DNA sequence: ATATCTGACACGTGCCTGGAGACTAGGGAGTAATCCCCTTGGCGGTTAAAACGCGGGGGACAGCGCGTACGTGCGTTTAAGCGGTGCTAGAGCTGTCTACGACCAATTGAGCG
């Protein structure tokens, strides 16, 4: 469902934030977002100030 | 029955440990020149080596006796907790002086006459 929404939103040109609960889920989201070369950034609480 | 508790279970950031990248420039690795060394090896004043004849004393008893062992008495030993509360390291920060850097003199080793 997320991939069809990101292809929807990328075709429309809108800027998007993705929220998740788990850092292990954010790893999965990042490996997807890298694989589809979407451009990506992450700021888990283990990121430095 | 109910309030609310003790996991479940996770991502918050702290700390330091611990890795790999790109730089200088300290120093390691490559080399002759050449000397001076570890090493080979004959020389005879000096002591390892073993008898004979021999001196110093090692050896095996008998038993006396100044000390040594057991293991309980009895009064002196440390144990023991937990009161107060001064010491004690943390640790935060100077406030410099002290040992370690930067520039160049008295004294030394090398050259051979």
Swiss-Prot record:
The chain holds residues 1105 to 1153 of 1556 of the full protein. It is found in: Cytoplasm; Nucleus; Cytoplasm, Cytoskeleton, Spindle; Chromosome. Although the ATP-dependent helicase activity displayed by the INO80 complex requires INO80 ATPase activity, it is likely that the helicase function is carried out by the other components of the complex, RUVBL1 and RUVBL2, and not by INO80 itself. ATPase component of the chromatin remodeling INO80 complex which is involved in transcriptional regulation, DNA replication and DNA repair. Binds DNA. As part of the INO80 complex, remodels chromatin by shifting nucleosomes. Regulates transcription upon recruitment by YY1 to YY1-activated genes, where it acts as an essential coactivator. Involved in UV-damage excision DNA repair. The contribution to DNA double-strand break repair appears to be largely indirect through transcriptional regulation. Involved in DNA replication. The DBINO region is involved in binding to DNA. Belongs to the SNF2/RAD54 helicase family. This is Chromatin-remodeling ATPase INO80. Component of the chromatin remodeling INO80 complex; three different complex modules assemble on different domains of INO80. Interacts with DDB1. Interacts with transcriptional repressor protein YY1; the interaction recruits the INO80 complex to YY1 target genes. Interacts with YY1AP1. Interacts with tubulin alpha. According to PubMed:10574462, widely expressed. According to PubMed:16298340, specifically expressed in brain, liver and pancreas.
